[PDB]
């Protein structure tokens, strides 16, 4: 329509004309914000006790958000909780404003006096993400029902011979289609799922048996898909997974890092 699809997807020549780009700071910086804004989303969501799903739906709102507004006029550290908030409203595990705030605050301000609920400072804070939320809405054009790549990947898991031990190394790897890649604004959940697995099992050295009667075992999750691309992308994904300055004291390791438990 206006459009059904053309809405939230862009060309590499577009994210260069970022709207945070028409302002005085870098790409090397911006690429670096988003990952550090989603990164915050994670921390709080874990602290709030919400599904890793909601976290992801925020990360997609965030991504989708700053393709319309600069990071100069809406700082990532205050659109983050604004969106995690409206997210866990949508995916349905509500948490209440004063609950989000009280967390965000012990996120960003570890050694502070836990907030006075009556201070003009506070009754202005809440006054704000309230107005922000009206923005993060008017911005995603009220399109909050978000489709993820994990919904798909969950589809072609044991629908091939795949050791669980390395069959969910793709589930996990999807969530980076979000944290550290601009992927979610470029190609669809399917196409993007194809990648989070063709890469997942080149570290796992197990590969895909091709399906017998004349159709590839990856052409069953999306219609237009080439290795010419998927190889092209897993490059990006990796030289982006390693275009990172060793900041990977990594994302959903707080105390869920090591492969499950020994100690």
């Amino acid at each position: 329509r206006k459009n059904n699809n053309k809405r939230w997807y862009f060309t590499r020549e577009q994210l260069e004309n970022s709207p945070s780009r028409r302002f005085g700071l870098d790409p090397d910086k911006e690429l670096s914000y988003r990952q550090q804004a989603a990164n915050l989303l994670q921390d709080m969501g874990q602290r709030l006790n919400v599904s890793q799903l909601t976290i992801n739906t925020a990360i997609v709102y965030m991504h989708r958000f700053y393709m319309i507004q600069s990071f100069t006029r809406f700082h990532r550290n205050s659109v983050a909780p604004a969106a995690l908030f409206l997210a866990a409203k949508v995916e349905e595990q509500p948490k209440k404003l004063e609950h989000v705030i009280k967390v965000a605050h012990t996120c960003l301000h570890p050694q502070e006096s836990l907030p006075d609920t009556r201070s003009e400072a506070y009754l202005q804070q809440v006054q704000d993400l309230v107005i922000l939320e009206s923005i993060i809405l008017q911005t995603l054009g009220f399109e909050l029902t978000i489709d993820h790549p994990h919904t798909h990947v969950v589809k072609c898991t044991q629908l091939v011979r795949a050791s669980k031990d390395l069959a969910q190394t793709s589930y996990f790897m999807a969530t980076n289609s979000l944290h550290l890649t601009t992927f979610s604004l470029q190609y669809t959940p399917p196409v993007v799922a194809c990648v989070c697995i063709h890469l997942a099992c080149k570290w796992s050295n197990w590969e895909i048996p091709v399906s017998t009667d004349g159709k590839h075992w990856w052409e069953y999750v999306d219609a237009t898909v080439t290795l010419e691309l998927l190889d092209e992308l897993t490059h990006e994904f990796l030289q982006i997974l390693e275009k990172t300055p060793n900041r990977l004291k990594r994302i959903w390791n707080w105390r869920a890092c090591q492969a499950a438990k020994k100690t």
Binding site: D43, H105, C107, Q111, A121
Partner: peptide
Amino acid sequence: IDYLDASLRKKNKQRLKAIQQGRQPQYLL
């Protein structure tokens, strides 16, 4: 772990936490 970069924010945490002599966070989130 850290949207809390050292330091351009790790820094303000130092500036805020050191108006802990009678001035307070204007904005604190």
